[PDB]
Amino acid sequence: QCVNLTTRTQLPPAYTNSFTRGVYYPDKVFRSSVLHSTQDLFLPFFSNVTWFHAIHKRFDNPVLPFNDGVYFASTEKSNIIRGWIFGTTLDSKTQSLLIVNNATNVVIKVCEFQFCNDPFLGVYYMESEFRVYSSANNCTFEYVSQPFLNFKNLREFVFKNIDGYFKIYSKHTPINLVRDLPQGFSALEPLVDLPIGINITRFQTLLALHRSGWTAGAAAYYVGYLQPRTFLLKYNENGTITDAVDCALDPLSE
Amino acid sequence: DSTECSNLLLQYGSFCTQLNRALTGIAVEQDKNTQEVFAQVKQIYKTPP
Amino acid sequence: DSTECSNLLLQYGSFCTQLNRALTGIAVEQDKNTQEVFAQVKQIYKTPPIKDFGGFNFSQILPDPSKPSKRSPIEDLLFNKVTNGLTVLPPLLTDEMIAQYTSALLAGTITSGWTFGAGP
Amino acid sequence: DSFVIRGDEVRQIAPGQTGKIADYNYKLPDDFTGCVIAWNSNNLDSKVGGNYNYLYRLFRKSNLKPFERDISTEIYQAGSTPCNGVEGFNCYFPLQSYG
Amino acid sequence: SALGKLQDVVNQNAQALNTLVKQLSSNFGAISSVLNDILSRLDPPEAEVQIDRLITGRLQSLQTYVTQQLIRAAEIRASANLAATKMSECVLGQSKRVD
Amino acid sequence: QIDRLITGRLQSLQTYVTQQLIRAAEIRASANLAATKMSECVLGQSKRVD
Amino acid sequence: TKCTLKSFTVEKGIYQTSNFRVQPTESIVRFPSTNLVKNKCVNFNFNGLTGTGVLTESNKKFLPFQQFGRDIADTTDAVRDPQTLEILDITPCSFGGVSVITPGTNTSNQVAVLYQGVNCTEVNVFQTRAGCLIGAEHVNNSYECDIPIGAGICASYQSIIA
Ligand SMILES: *[C@@H]1O[C@H](CO)[C@@H](O[C@@H]2O[C@H](CO)[C@@H](O)[C@H](O)[C@H]2NC(C)=O)[C@H](O)[C@H]1NC(C)=O
Ligand SMILES: *[C@@H]1O[C@H](CO)[C@@H](O[C@@H]2O[C@H](CO)[C@@H](O)[C@H](O)[C@H]2NC(C)=O)[C@H](O)[C@H]1NC(C)=O
Ligand SMILES: *[C@@H]1O[C@H](CO)[C@@H](O)[C@H](O)[C@H]1NC(C)=O
Ligand SMILES: *[C@@H]1O[C@H](CO)[C@@H](O)[C@H](O)[C@H]1NC(C)=O
Ligand SMILES: *[C@@H]1O[C@H](CO)[C@@H](O)[C@H](O)[C@H]1NC(C)=O
Ligand SMILES: *[C@@H]1O[C@H](CO)[C@@H](O)[C@H](O)[C@H]1NC(C)=O
Ligand SMILES: *[C@@H]1O[C@H](CO)[C@@H](O)[C@H](O)[C@H]1NC(C)=O
């Protein structure tokens, strides 16, 4: 089942500053009281991060490129953002990745889904609406896990695809800032490594409608793109990354 | 300017860094030598006319 | 611990012996340097218990009895201000013995002037 | 060292080769010096009904040393069940003939 | 920065040791920098070549380290000879030499 | 082939840097001597013979 | 010492002759497998990570994602056991130089051995900061240095005293 959403309001997407966000742990190695230089796919400091809104009538589900990797930030309250779609053609011709977080658990499936033009979840004012794909014929990987998840919650994710392995990095932050990204540092813990082995070039954000037509809950998300670069990470005595330096940002940090 | 040569040169590690650091040490050592030899006075004296 | 690597390494000859010999020469040279600098007196001179030197105060350079290391306040400050088959050999002269040599030199140059350097 | 082998096995009479007669019949060392000589003998070492006088070690527990010869006609245990010198299920003679 | 001369020597020695240890992580054109990985993944005819590449790279690194250690040893020996001269002439006597 | 050129040029550069370090040590010794002569012969009168 | 110096007569002094490495007594495999042996120099295989070392109980506070810990030189100094989630330090097995302290062969054939940087319980036994000294008796009297051992310790012949 698919439903076209025809009550959207036309507006260009916004842009804002990344500040010093998007740093994730590059590996599973404990390091204490050290300064470690690593060359990996990172989000540049103070970069131009694209800003999308969900407010009522804004419902931002465009088609975005994946490129080398995607940093996804979420200023979220009341649980509208539910999952992501990854793939190349987003149809039954190729094999695509589904990540959803419904009312009970988190489900990851790698199948040839015939995706809808507007995939979405729904909350009735209970969850009784799910319209993401119309079919699923060839499924290779399944993974059911625990639930991962004024704006009160900040969700950071990093999606990378190297050597057929999909690395998802996550961080949950209690915030009380109203509109933009708070200025500070928080290193993203690695969340999951999936041996999906599929080609990914395009991705989709999954949102949830509110029904009482439809109403969009207040949410905002940010999309940034990873580039191959070097960071200098500082590990404290407790093994937590507390500060970082972008090696190619300015001559002082260089 | 060969990128394949630099990619193969990265397999050898930090030899280039050691050579650059040694040459930098020699270069600052020459200035230190000149400073020790000639800059032994902090007042610039002149002869009478 | 690879036996095959060592067997292949034996084809190159006595390179390892040369490197070990050079490092051993450096290691003995450091001890020789410390002997040449600090061990220039064969008598361990000591200051008198009464520090009556005609108004001259040497408390900042003489060893402090209160400190367990028996170092001077200046030497204590100096020591505070300096911060896979590899081994570090300890120096032949420890820090307390080097401090003792400096204390002997200080006692000689305070109580005897330059006479102790040329004879009795 | 004289023997008779197949036509595709003449590449295995060489130092540093992986192969079947290299492991269980005739092994050359890595520091081998000398010459390997091979020539076709279909006119002499072949019969129209089958010349079965040439045998190779199909089964062995471990690879040979260089210049090591195994003529021992003891049975091989190819399964979990011991053979006790008697042929049976997963109990095979080590020496099989070329056809 | 009063005690920079001693700290420079300490930093140089520690940096040389860190560089020498760090050079083990480089494969020097081999498939891997770990000897156990090469010995467990490859046969001895090609593992010999990979180990040879690692040996020549590590030996070049060690010879380089010994070379700068000897040069620094000469510099420290010259400084120590100067220090011994200052101990003999300034502490054990009064020197007429200017500066 | 590029690896052969790299190892040859790296050996040449290491040889050059090593001999430059040895000459730098020699020049440093000569400069220390020159500073000693500046202090003792120019800034004062020296009793040291020759 | 005679074989190392390539001479049948050895002068008085200390001579570096060999290298002492504590051999791995057992081999341990831990997969998500053998028993876990601590406080001994053993070979270890943790999740495909091979090595040789002494496993000790650790006071580190590894976060859940973190599995094996690296030091300054990027060597694995701490590892988490994949079956029982506990942290173990990996100290490198005891290695050191073996030096032979001897007087001249004209004087005597008695020798002492110094294991550099090796404690005496992992090898006339005397523990010095320079290492473990075997074959030389320790005296409380102080003399001039005849054969240098290190860390203020010297050896002489009078038997060999330290
Ligand atoms: C929702 O809208 C999309 C886009 O208008 C529809 O997708 C089109 O489906 C028709 C089916 O005949 C195709 O011919 C078009 O090429 C599709 N366009 C795109 C951009 O994919 C989709 O069918 C609509 N959903 C429903 C239920 O009508
Ligand atoms: C020599 O100098 C020392 C240190 O400058 C003097 O010790 C000081 O004495 C005064 C007066 O009792 C104290 O207030 C200071 O705290 C002391 N300083 C230290 C570092 O202990 C000492 O009095 C001087 N004179 C003699 C004769 O020793
Ligand atoms: C971000 O990009 C948009 C267009 O892509 C541009 O108009 C805007 O000025 C950029 N912002 C910054 C801070 O560079
Ligand atoms: C969540 O998705 C799983 C997977 O299909 C399903 O079994 C479960 O019933 C769903 N829960 C809800 C509340 O829809
Ligand atoms: C994928 O699905 C289609 C239709 O369900 C089927 O014909 C095809 O063989 C499947 N391919 C694989 C690799 O399972
Ligand atoms: C992945 O898909 C893109 C576009 O469909 C294509 O250009 C690329 O070659 C593909 N890569 C692989 C490894 O299949
Ligand atoms: C590290 O953790 C300890 C708790 O054992 C805490 O007291 C200390 O402040 C922490 N350090 C940092 C930099 O957070």
UniProtKB/Swiss-Prot annotation, chain C:
Superkingdom to which the source organism belongs: Viruses
Residue positions with a glycan: 57
Annotated phenotype, changing residue 52 to H: In strain: B.1.1.318
Site (Cleavage) residue list: 71-72
Function: Precursor of the fusion protein processed in the biosynthesis of the S protein and the formation of virus particle. Mediates fusion of the virion and cellular membranes by functioning as a class I viral fusion protein. Contains two viral fusion peptides that are unmasked after cleavage. The S2/S2' cleavage occurs during virus entry at the cell membrane by host TMPRSS2 or during endocytosis by host CSTL.
Designated name of the protein: Spike protein S2
Species for this entry: Severe acute respiratory syndrome coronavirus 2
Lineage: Viruses, Riboviria, Orthornavirae, Pisuviricota, Pisoniviricetes
UniProtKB/Swiss-Prot annotation, chain G:
UniProt gene name: S
Taxonomic source organism: Severe acute respiratory syndrome coronavirus 2 (2019-nCoV)
Superkingdom, taxonomy of origin: Viruses
Quaternary organization: Binds to host ACE2. RBD also interacts with the N-linked glycan on 'Asn-90' of ACE2. Cleavage of S generates a polybasic C-terminal sequence on S1 that binds to host Neuropilin-1 (NRP1) and Neuropilin-2 (NRP2) receptors. Interacts with host integrin alpha-5/beta-1 (ITGA5:ITGB1) and with ACE2 in complex with integrin alpha-5/beta-1 (ITGA5:ITGB1). May interact via cytoplasmic c-terminus with M protein. May interact (via N-terminus) with host bilirubin and biliverdin, thereby preventing antibody binding to the SARS-CoV-2 spike NTD via an allosteric mechanism.
Glycosylation sites (chain numbering): 25, 27, 106, 119, 140
Known function: Attaches the virion to the cell membrane by interacting with host receptor, initiating the infection. The major receptor is host ACE2. When S2/S2' has been cleaved, binding to the receptor triggers direct fusion at the cell membrane. When S2/S2' has not been cleaved, binding to the receptor results in internalization of the virus by endocytosis using host TFRC and GRM2 and leading to fusion of the virion membrane with the host endosomal membrane. Alternatively, may use NRP1/NRP2 and integrin as entry receptors.
Region (Disordered): 21-32
Interval of the full protein contained in this chain: 299 to 694 of 1273
Name under which the protein is recorded: Spike protein S1
Record-annotated disulphide pairs: 41-93, 120-132, 145-154
